[PDB]
Every structure is written in C-alpha cells, then in structure tokens.
Amino acid sequence: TKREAILKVLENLTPEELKKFKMKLGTVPLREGFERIPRGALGQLDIVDLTDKLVASYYEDYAAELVVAVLRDMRMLEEAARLQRAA
C-alpha cells in the first residue's frame, strides 16, 4: 500500500512532469549500499515497472522518501504531501 501510493501519484503526472521526475530521480544521491539505476534503463520503464523497480531497489519506505523528495524538489507539494501522508 506504499507501492500503490507511489503508483497513483506518479500516474497523476503529465508525461512532461514525468520525464522530469524520472530525470532528476536518476541523479539523487543514495544511502550507502544502494545503487543508482541508470537513466537509460529508467527511461524505457512504464509507471508500474518504475514503481516496482524503485521498491525492489530501495525498499518501500526509502523509495517513498526518495519520491517525496524528488517531488518537493519539483515544488509539486500537493502530490508530495499526499504521498507523505499516504506513508
């Protein structure tokens, strides 16, 4: 149910808002022991696979923190707060 929360919120993004979201998530520095997903692999991922891939890579809590943070950094803070509260 954090997985579905990420999904919903991502699905609310215009496809322009999405590319941007994806592009900047791919530059966020990560806690030790976690690996970035290369931006190319990232780009050819639909919303659902993107969501799962984040959760597989970073686990549910971290993945949500990451997303929130990339959103806040996008100033999309309704969607940020929704997810935030949703987790």
Which CATH number fits the domain that encloses residue 1?
1.10.533.10
Q: How many domains does the chain have?
A: 1
**Cα–Cα distance for residue pair 33/13, rounded to 1 Å:** 30
**Triad 69, 17, 54: Cα angle to 5°:** 50
**Cα–Cα distance for residue pair 1/7, rounded to 1 Å:** 10
With CA atoms as reference, report the closest residue to 60 among 80, 87, 38: 87
Q: Which two tokens stand for residue 31?
A: 């806690």
SS3 34: coil
- Experimentally, the structure was elucidated by X-ray
Task: Show the beta-strand stretches assigned E in the chain.
Answer: none
Q: State which residues form the domain around 9.
A: 1-87
Q: Which residue has the tokens 């929360």?
A: 5
H or E element in which residue 52 lies: helix 47-58
